[model samples]
Target: VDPVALYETLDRATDKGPLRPAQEAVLGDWFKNYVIIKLHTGQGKTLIGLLILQSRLCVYLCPDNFLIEQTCEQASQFILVTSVQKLFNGLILMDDAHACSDRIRDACKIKIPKDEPAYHALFKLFSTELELQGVGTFADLENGKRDALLPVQCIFSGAALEIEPHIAPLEDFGSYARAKHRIFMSATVTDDSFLVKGLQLSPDTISNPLTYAKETWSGEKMVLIPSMMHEDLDRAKIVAWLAPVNPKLKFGIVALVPSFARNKDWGAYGAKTVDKDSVSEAVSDLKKGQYGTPLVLANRYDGIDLPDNTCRVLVFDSRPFSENLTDLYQEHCRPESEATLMRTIRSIEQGMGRSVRGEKDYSVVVAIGADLVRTLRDVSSRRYLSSQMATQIEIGLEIAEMAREEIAAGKEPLAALVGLINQCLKRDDGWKDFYADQMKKVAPKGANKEILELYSRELAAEQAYAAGDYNRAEQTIQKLLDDGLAHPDDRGWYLQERARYLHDGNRVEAQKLQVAAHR
Candidate 1:
């Protein structure tokens, strides 16, 4: 590696102060094989990423869109590149690097279009470890294929860096330690226990009471003054769990709970009402009032605000390391409910972030039940965060969650998706080949070309329906519905798509199955 010239060039461009002292110390080390840098939250992890990106031509894997947006912005600042589709290479990035959830992570991988150069490159990349054949330069990426030119480095981010398929032996976090450079930045990184158990990092590697730098940053003091729940609590007990010794409430408090699955919106039972955004807005409204309390949920999607006033809360949700660590893993490790996982992490991050602003304090009321008490106790076994780092982690998680959500969604752009479908259908021209292809998948390889004669005939009947031949469409689908032994799920999906087509053309039965599928 051209270390001297690269360092000289980098130094000539800018002073080393852009990064923190601690970050600069470990700039070229990852946990194992990957480079790992531990910096404070929001300290331009992406900026340093720029240095690694130059000449590397790699994939930047992140845990979420928070990193994606930051990296995208950083990339634009450094290059004169035009975006064709959403999948741009020279930096192929996977947001949540840990192979925690295949469904989410696999979904992020770019689809290699058929027989294109980029496709061929990717085929070789995935199928063999050799450099891509005849594939060089970012501009050569084809219309249908997305292949990042090598030495293509793959990056994984998130509290836990490695991806673990549920069925396999967990990956070696050691791989990252060997990374030419590994960077870790988060307020709660040391507090997170999933990294402990998943990566098997010794307590010293993560954090230690005797040696770890535990610094608290009270940047935006969170005030947790009581406000009624927005949902129903037909006869609920509202309690304020407080940290003793101060008993003094100085900051304006926003009464919000971290638990949404259990907390009922006060509006549900005709109690006081407010959504998350409004609560933050309310905090701004009553900055000078005697009892101005903002209600917050600390959810991922919608929760962040600043009050011009310096009011702060006296007691906030200051759980021990165990509680914080478990909650962190539960929210982001990708094992939770797929539908709401993204949303959930964002909420808590937002909620936690609102508190402890810029050296201010907040009065927080945590609603801990007997069941959660044990978990809270377990947290004491872990390390604690200095206030500054604690608040910083909360903010970092919030940003990362937001970015993860965005990157996850951006993978599917409208034009490219439509173009893909259109190209596929155009190549085939008629439905005969399409249905035959699907059916032929189950047949023996090299078997008769007429392996799916009957199904192809049925699809042809439906194609006639597309050509304003409704009677034939009805006949074709009916025959298949009567005799096909396809999987119920597959049949349902196909019928659902067909039903949508029929509804668009004013068919009644298709609409019926559309409703039936809902059932």
Candidate 2:
């Protein structure tokens, strides 16, 4: 690849520490084959894939909205990495795979907006606008299901909830998944025992396959270091953590899991303990250290700005996303607030894209503040939250109520519905039409003596001159001068028009009039 363009991120990977044999092996598998590399949690797994994905265009899929947020922070420097439906090229990474409900999948299926012709053309690669009779729907295809006419490649990374059932059982995803490469990651891959069984390998194939055909992670002095929360810990804690290491050396790091906030056991932390809200600032400040580097904890919509020239920090937080259990989907599935669903998804997706920009060290830190993480873990919470979700439900009800009012007013319900829908889709205001019609009043009435002799001729001359018409345009101006109606303020324009006309007419002594006009 272009060294200057991608060299910065590459240097970051090297500066962190060399990849372990297993990490390298997993990366090599992704490079050569459509292999699924299953690494344990907190094992620098994302970096393994990121370094490999850098070699070519790659798409990273996450299991839930939380992962999307976390991955965005880690990969924010890579500006080209956008979500599944947005405008982006170099790398496409989608976090939270199983969290996709029928609504979201359907949204992706319908990439083009009904009224947006330009957007439809621009995003045609991802969706097909299916028209029935007069109405239409845009359906976006998953990686493998893309049109046969397209020569494109895609990769999906996310948790496996019912993917096998949804794609394989229905026979919808077999063609797509088989056509494109596949990569599956998780701290809990064993839960997908059937997937491993499909490969006809050992019980622990992903973590450690059969001896002869083995895939294992070799130890390379990788450590799971303990870390104090910014609140409890002072700069001394960071100093102590790095005191044992060589001060000059930078290495790939993975901080062990534990609560950071609400911990109170520091001896000399004179300053106020930092909390979740202040982590972004702390991380940004920590990157400027001579010794102890602060691991940034990324949260959705937390305004954390990582420096461009520092280090690549990795934050690990992955969980399952199942719409069957999410509250937002359950609450919004009906016609009540279908429109609002798009906004909620967009908000979460927008927040998720915070990491990996070009050749910068992608420093990622994860915290447990957003509800998405909790939703992924608690099926009941997911369902409860989705059901109570206000966005689409409120919009749907508002429109429904408005239609009810229109119907009570004796308007046809079908017509009312159509009007409501139209209003929702109306991009331009109606008043612009009023303005266009009013401009017509300024035009002179045809055949009126005063209009033709004075106003129309003069106004037309001025307008035509402004619009660059010299010959015929100047004739009107000359009529004004000859009629002695030219305004003093309009005299310069009148003379300029006259001079232009004189150039091509081969006229002499026009200066006599020019001298008179000047006087």
Candidate 3:
């Protein structure tokens, strides 16, 4: 068993505050067995995870590069694993699990010869773990160490919604299934059962769930303005017009613009317009009210941490719904409409999350699309905002309208809005009950249980392959195909797994299967 002394070492070195009872309970259960830990944004999950990794040969995986870079820099013993050989020994961290699949797809396109060291390096890094079952081959030996087959502690971080479906086939992730212990942490994991079943872990798992019910957060008196009203104009022009209307207003704006905005002429707005390269500078300037206004792209939505008087206004210049969701529903056989909704709503929540970072912070969120308000009314999309502050879209609009009248009547618009926001905050804890009530009124629809079970089974087969149980993997893949659940998109995954099972004894048959799957 791993000692608690490492945790104590990390606890003292990191200078983190005392863990809540919920955090402590999760740590206790995690060391005992594999568990899923859920903590909200500000609950210090990163610090907790770092401490847990103490004195353990753990490989931490996340969906984004920023998180990997951020985490690796904190601990000296931790090392980044970009190639297959890096996984041989010591603690490993991958920026993104999807990187393996992406590289594999690219390597195949280049028509890299199988006999070459370069091709084998890329291929064997993400291949199945068969040596654990006393199965070894030339491909496995092509890479350096046989010790790569040994299990290590695994931690998968971030709230990547499609992780189960996207990463299920990848060999890098398969190693985690056979690990000594595993931990999956995320702020928003709506479907726990899928993850548990997908990994073929014991159904009995421990979790730590937290919400914003008790915490008082006041920010973002949101106003829904119709974009159709000014369809011909860009954000620069719109803000240019709004400047004179509220001259006293010093704004910090994040407008979703086209790629060519950097080359355009801003004249007076030039000094205020922020460059993408200087997001940190823009944030600092916005906080000090030194810059005119900071304009950024959609990528800035997730990581920005503007609180208090730093940002007085947030302008979402585009529609918030994900276009990726639209394509998936139309092209793919699997119906994940609800999943798409959660992803979109979660994005909006993340944008809103930036504004009200602190309890006393206040800002006005102006999303230029009245139709977006309908999302707040609909039961399907509305449920995502159930626990969020500033959930009342109509009320936020109404307050904005009230403040507009005050500005028109020679009152300071900023002063009027600030006062109105404070009042909204005081009213029944910033209408926390109001938002919770609306969410309660809408009953959540149940997921497609049959499809969920099918995915779980498919992942179970992958798990079997990782553990070198070819017979089990082969049986499950055939079952999925026999049931007619294997769509065209799924055919490649199905064929590849089938090929893996045959690769050992019948290399000729495995080659044919591999060729078929490639096409």
Candidate 4:
């Protein structure tokens, strides 16, 4: 039951070899507070956390139920697996903490669901007041909307209370504040400043994390960007070839697309459509071996884990989109902002991580669609992708050129790609070595200061507003406006934040700001 003893027996029993280089390296920082271990995907985050916190009664936190379920077995003895919804007072290891802020924002959000029976009751309760409250688009909301964030004051104002008198943004979370020691572990944490800002931690916390982003994942991942070959060698074609291969049986193929249109495109290629309604059955069937058909899902990139035979053929047919309304609004309001760009990069990386779950895991990751390809192909954006994936994408580009040459010389397009897939699926030594060689030259990246500053300001303002210091909050937002924040998208959005702060104090000024923001 000793830490080292546990790691040794577990490693040998699982046949996953000894402590991984990244895992071993992380153990050195096992004693630190506010620890952030940024390892490459499949580089043993679970094992590292387990070993490091083996002696303590730690809560192993994950972003969703899927991860919680998957993680429960590993840390079942001493660690309690949980989600952000639950809180623990002692030590906590937040797995996949890259998405922690999103979870927190989600928790803080008070949703007015569109389909709820109380929709009309709530609609009647607040619509007229919201309209009079100077929400610029309240009329459109009245016609058809689930409702947006009504000012917190509006929630309790002439009516209710519980009433925690104050609202906390990403702080405390009740259980969150109670935790004495917290460690966040993830692969895609290039944006530490975001976590620090959201969690309200000191800058010194993750300033020097235990980073192994450039660490080589023992898994054999042969990433294929078919879009790099020819314009016709696109997402639809790849799905058409793979999904229909054995339609009557499970093809061991699945896709992660951004929207219903792409989901329909995959369905056209013989994929079994899985929506929010059918996903549980879809996953259960998938785990039933070849009894399942090739599945296509619009809303799954993170949370779901598909390793080995469960997903030998993983397809990300398009770029991922923001997960929830909180994030979606950020993209809409700040399309060109650095903060937005980092989130997009993280979203893509999250999709990349879907296929491979461990060192022994092997799969062919098919990245299709021009939007996703351009991001991987263009050097400026490529650097943001962890060096390992960037190397995979670059190698994929080289392999794609050969595939195109084969197609040009009369080889069937899909056959050429199948051959490429075989080179990986067959575990070609050459393919694996090329990756290792390229990976050796890679280096980890640091988060951008400017972006960090932006995150800091956003958090600072939110904290101020939550503490009922509207004056301080508005001043912080006013600085962003005066700095000539480009993009009407961002300017308008910030103006609205400023409006929220002034909403109760001066309805006239807030109304003017709201109209300007709407414009």
Candidate 5:
């Protein structure tokens, strides 16, 4: 396809537009059969996707149904779009490709909810096996006994099915192998190795090039965190007070929480919690312009769009937790693993991005919760974030200090917070000029190969366990235990895990390891 021709296709598809520099960069960049494209949010990455679809009948995989609908509405005139469920074999273009890990696990997980008819029979079947696992009561999985996922063991590995063997992740699916000419697109792909491994592709396949687009940012996005700057400031108190009373807080304010436990907090203050039951109503309310109650949604980092006046403030409440068995093994067990940290970085960056969609759009993003606030402030963690965002965090911290001093000086806390909001919303020539000067001093963060390799080996260890190769599994865990993890908080889980693999044949050694597993 010609670059000039593709530009014309996008022009007509979007009802006429100039060839934006960032969009122009990708026009001639797709030279390989497999390439990963990175463009910041507000850049026209979707137009690049549409150009690719203009020449090929592609299976453009999106994060959720809503994105698919929006993508179809944009490209309907030029191409016939279909669901990932409806089609699997074709040219692949994954939107927010970093999320392929979650999408894959969700597709393969076998959940038995309490209301299911056969739940009782399966509970009885696995109860004996789960008893020896002893980390958590498998009985909790049935109802509200506990609300967490149990670690995977050989007893749970799929071998009994006559129809299908145990399929582990997205790569394990036979249907996924039929796809050809892969292209991955994302706004934040901090770790290249994680993206490739998550998509079931090998890093050895990196003869495939990566196309980078310069972030074209000229607007103000004041990502503030009062709780982060001071020990006494309460994020929940700030949100609670600001939700209803502050008249300046308009054009929809929503909080993004990781779980329902956190989501339920809003319902206490008579605000609507956006669960599966009320997401439609909640989304519709944002579109109405005069949102009545503060809406709280769980794990909506990438799928939904909240551009312009649709959302002015996004309070990212907490870091997301693993909801299913596959991620539970990866995320909950090995919390400090590079894969876990990268996902945390991506989720918060993407979630805060919900408000500022395009170059012209702007919003005041607030970071809340202990984990989230700590992450934003931690210097080591900022290494993986794009320089533009890392700079925003630096600038936000300075203003946050000023706000903290006001609250400490006996100025009403709510009044001070409202004043802080105006610095971004009402705008100041001095502030914008300072931001642009600092922005000119920085460049995007480059990928870390050291962290990339650490994440790769972590996934390989899990892959060995899933294959029922206990020897390889135990050795891999031991290797990771000795060389990879340095934190004391992370080692006990690995020791306990390695002990599980050691038990069947080397019970004596397993007992010694299990003893050390006790903190």
Candidate 6:
């Protein structure tokens, strides 16, 4: 698998056509070191990643199942595997690679014969704690849940960070450390400094090869003040706005609802309470223009592409901030505010991105709260905006103001609204200067190099705990304290992390840490 030969082979493959000019530059730096390749929607990142790592024993990790399935379908030549049994000795594509714990646990239960060298080798590589030399006994392997990760030669992972919140911190996974080369791609890679430090990425290797068709969104959006008192009815009112005045005009509403409101019906309007299980059916029906108003929750936000009039109205019942985020903020010694704001803004941006998917596609995005509008206008929030997204947002706010003026004058402003939005969406450079100015204002604030380094270590500790490696996590934290990197007040937070690790095994030690942290 010579690099030259494999590169030539990738070029010849019909499914993955010749690498684009930008992709060539990015992939050409394959062996340089760790790189974060930022490419827009139409840019050939998927194929670029595949071509560079095709020669080695590579494991491609995607954030969602959709991308996993899509990648595997396109490249049938690569081994699309989830379990450790088929994990080794090939080009593997693992979807939902963040579920490292679940995969390893499932692998432990599989009864592999002792004679199979491949099985033994994988078992050795994955399972660190649960000892199984021969691997014939299914009994010992069953229910053996421990921290494990598969060693790979190279890794290529992608996630649109703003939308994909629970993206597994790949830097924390011990398995990912084995890879000689790594590539992380996203359509929106704002705040490269935070990402570079957070993911332990080499600053010199960051590349933005964003070559995208200028797709303008000619949609009329409004921030509607909810007429109903209950939060659920606010969602209901937003759906009502999308209702057709006559029978000729077809309209659909996709509501991001809360968990409690999942089973509740929306009057005689013919709406379905869609959950994760029925999301596919609901999405298909919506895409085919059958569903009137299909209500969905948070998980269906990203990766479910509803293109061109499939869904003309998108309603966010409430701001998409995590409810438990406040607790995490106070509990940790990190920049929780910036992190939380970034997550919220990214989710909103992704939802808006979903509405007007095509250049000519038009839709109305109505929000229930003023907080969303406030956050969009904030300077801190602008840091996360890609120059193009910033432009769209700027234009969106301007159009929203126009719509408000038209509505106040007692006129149906849909036609005029769409026309105004289209004019703004025609060219990509409409708001480039404004967007660039905003980008210049984005810099890592208040945190010094020492604090940032400690923050990174704290993140690593959290990841280790998430993976169920208590010992490794404790060691990292202890090292932080020993090196005098952590502040005095930060001791309480580190103790709390240790207490979480000790809760199951040693209740007394856990209680002591818990009590000390409070004190």
Clash counts for all predictions: 109, 52, 0, 0, 0, 0
List the global CA lDDT of all models: 0.33, 0.33, 0.44, 0.63, 0.61, 0.46
Candidate that beats the other on TM-score, 2 or 5, i.e. the better one: 5
* Reference-based TM-score, model 4: 0.78
Worst 10 residues of 5 by lDDT: 157-166
Q: TM-score of every model?
A: 0.32, 0.26, 0.49, 0.78, 0.83, 0.54
Per residue, candidate 5 scores C-alpha lDDT tens digits across 1-519 of 654245564435545576667666566666333246666656666667776665463656766564566567666443455545445532357666655455555555555545555655655576564555545554544444433543333224222111111223565455567656567676532344455455655554432334455654443677777676554556677545544523345577777777777655666676667663365566666787556677777765555677676777777766666545344345655667545666677666766656776766567887776777766667766776766667777777877877777877987766777777776666666766766776574455444555555556656666776667778877777777778553565667677767766676677887798788765
In lDDT terms, which candidate is top?
4
Cα lDDT for residue 148, candidate 3 = 23
lDDT by residue (7-33, candidate 6, tens digit) is: 555424455445555555555455343
Measure candidate 5: CA RMSD. Answer: 4.6
Selected candidate, larger lDDT, 3 vs 4: 4
Error of 2 at 79 (Å): 9.8
Q: Write the per-residue lDDT of candidate 2 for residues 195-216, one digit (tens) a residue.
A: 3211211232333321112332
Q: What is the lDDT of residue 345 in candidate 5?
A: 78
Candidate 1 residue spans exceeding 4 A from truth: 1-17, 28-36, 54-57, 76-189, 196-263, 266-374, 377-380, 383-519
TM-score of candidate 1 against the unseen true structure: 0.32
Model 3 misses residue 112 by how many Å?
18
What tens-digit string does per-residue lDDT give for candidate 4 at 173-225?
Answer: 65666667577786642445455544566555565667644454445667778
